[PDB]
Amino acid sequence: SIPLLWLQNCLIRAADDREEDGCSQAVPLVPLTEENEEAMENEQFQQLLRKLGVRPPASGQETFWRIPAKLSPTQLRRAAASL
């Protein structure tokens, strides 16, 4: 639930940033706590991430999951409101 709330806030901030900026870039989900990182390594949570539209790190070059630039403020807000 703490990781869920962190996720929600990440989605909403990405929505706000894209809407304000007018152009959108991929955003990393950067866990700052062990517990949140632990959530990111969890199969269930990852399945949730994939449905909401969050992409796994690129093979070899990345460890952080990314909010794809394609996702609009509306899609992000819907994903956030959905859980």
């Binding site: 870039q25 950067v30 706590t33 062990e34 517990e35 990182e37 790190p57 070899g60 460890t63 952080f64």
Partner: protein
Amino acid sequence: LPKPVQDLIKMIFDVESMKKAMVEYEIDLQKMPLGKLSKRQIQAAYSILSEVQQAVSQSSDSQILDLSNRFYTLIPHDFGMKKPPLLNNADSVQAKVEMLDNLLDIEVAYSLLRSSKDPIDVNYEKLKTDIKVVDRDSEEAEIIRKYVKNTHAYDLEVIDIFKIEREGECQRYKPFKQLHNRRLLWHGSRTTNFAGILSQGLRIAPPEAPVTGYMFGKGIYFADMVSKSANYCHTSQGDPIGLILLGEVALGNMYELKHASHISKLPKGKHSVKGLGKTTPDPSANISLDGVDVPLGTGISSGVDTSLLYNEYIVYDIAQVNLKYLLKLKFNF
């Protein structure tokens, strides 16, 4: 383009330089010319090294022999009148992984090279990097020369400072400016690698590269002392010019280590490794440039039980790095 930039372009795209680097690695240039180097072959060579890695941790003389023969078939070497050395332990895995890292960058450079304009301008454009000369009289140049002087067999002279901005990289790095503990750090490399580094940025060894081939696993490595990073230029009297990067690195929570550790994944909550050295820039003289630490103090004793001489810093996501400066250095022996 300004003369120093033109000279920069010429030296990093130097084909004869790439050949000599390959020869220095005992590669058989006649059996595998620069032009037939391929990404596919290097990828498969990495994978063989990962097989040697696995064999070593379990392995017989004859499967070692075959892996070795498989490797050398893919990447022909010239050993002169010596028997070809077997790939028999972690030492050989590391040595081959490092050579493949360099071959990969050389392949990227040569692939870029594949009368509209000067050849210089065409090649510059292929780098997709804005390169500007930093004025030697600026505060910028002063700070950077201090960082060099203070954290210095050879003695070091700064010839040119370039401000560099890779296309797309500011936007990629931007979210990590939210991350704390950002530091301006050194990354040295062979000159033959810099076309690859400017066009693609600093990159991590691939999944098929052996993790045991890298002192702190597969990440991007930095130093806070220029003499540490100068070693990775592999300069020589016969050729006393090296190139070195300054990069801003978003380190976040550092996992502090005192010995080599072939990390596959950081501990939860950690964002980088710091290898703790015997020597460190005097923390007293650190300065901050808009939230970015520049440890340009002269080297003092860190007071740390370590096997490292100097600090090392490693990150494992490529977006945690933003290249800021490229220095052309003279090594005076």
